[PDB]
Amino acid sequence: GHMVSRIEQRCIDKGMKMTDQRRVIAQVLSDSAHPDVEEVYRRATAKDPRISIATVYRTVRLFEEESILERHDFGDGRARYEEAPSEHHDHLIDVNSARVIEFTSPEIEALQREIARKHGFRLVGHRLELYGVPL
Amino acid sequence: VSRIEQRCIDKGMKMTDQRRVIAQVLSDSADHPDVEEVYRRATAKDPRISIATVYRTVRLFEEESILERHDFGDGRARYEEAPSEHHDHLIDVNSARVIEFTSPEIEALQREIARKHGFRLVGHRLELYGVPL
Numbered sequence: 030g031h032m033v034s035r036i037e038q039r040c041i042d043k044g045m046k047m048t049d050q051r052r053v054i055a056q057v058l059s060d061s062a063h064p065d066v067e068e069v070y071r072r073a074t075a076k077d078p079r080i081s082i083a084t085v086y087r088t089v090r091l092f093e094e095e096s097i098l099e100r101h102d103f104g105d106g107r108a109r110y111e112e113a114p115s116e117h118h119d120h121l122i123d124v125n126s127a128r129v130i131e132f133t134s135p136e137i138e139a140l141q142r143e144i145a146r147k148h149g150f151r152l153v154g155h156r157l158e159l160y161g162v163p164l
Numbered sequence: 165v166s167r168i169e170q171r172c173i174d175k176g177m178k179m180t181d182q183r184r185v186i187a188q189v190l191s192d193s194a195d196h197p198d199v200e201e202v203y204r205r206a207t208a209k210d211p212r213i214s215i216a217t218v219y220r221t222v223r224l225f226e227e228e229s230i231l232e233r234h235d236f237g238d239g240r241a242r243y244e245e246a247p248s249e250h251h252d253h254l255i256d257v258n259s260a261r262v263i264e265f266t267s268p269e270i271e272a273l274q275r276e277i278a279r280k281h282g283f284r285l286v287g288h289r290l291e292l293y294g295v296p297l
Contacts, residue, residue: 030261032257032258037260038257042291044289124286132281144265145254148263150294153257156290158289159278159288161278162283163282164282164284
């Protein structure tokens with residue numbers, strides 16, 4: 030049991046497996062607001078002393094590859110990380126062409142709120158991806 | 165042939181009578197049994213089935229993605245057949261607990277959305293994130 034951090038939520042959106050080390054790293058990233066890998070590593074080891082710098086580096090790189098993080102050099106030469114932008118619109122994917130079709134459905138969002146409510150929850154986020162082939 | 169047994173066959177898994185009994189127990193269960201309930205029900209069918217065989221078999225069915233190990237809100241590992249279509253997920257952001265749900269209602273809207281853009285819907289992934297009221 031743990032709080033799902035904003036970065037962890039992005040990971041879950043991508044269907045990534047949340048191991049203990051990835052969870053710690055996601056939490057550290059969420060609580061930082063443009064750390065470099067050393068900063069992420071020091072903060073992660075403060076939570077789990079046996080997390081290695083290699084593991085931290087590989088994890089932030091994977092997050093970057095899956096567009097969960099963006100990486101930039103702000104001048105000092107260090108690679109620094111932030112939450113990547115997220116789309117407001119949900120997507121329909123044409124799986125044959127690998128093309129994205131944006132859509133918005135206030136109706137489907139109202140239903141998603143109702144589902145949360147029925148289960149005793151207030152909705153704080155959602156991601157829907159549809160997969161299609163042309164008619 | 166139980167539903168679980170058929171999954172095993174499709175995956176080319178070695179099947180024996182003891183594995184079939186365990187598969188049958190899982191398939192026939194009205195609740196979502198934990199390993200203790202699987203063992204008790206399996207030994208009632210064949211008393212030669214060991215507690216060790218039960219753990220190994222459920223863990224094998226896990227490793228092979230035929231079974232899903234899941235916390236339904238009681239902190240217990242309970243088992244469910246891996247569904248014909250992925251269940252949608254409502255994630256409690258306070259605990260990371262996943263509530264699996266189905267909504268024929270949302271699915272109808274999903275098909276309509278696909279249809280209006282000129283597509284047949286072939287799958288979806290939906291994650292909801294909530295805090296307890």
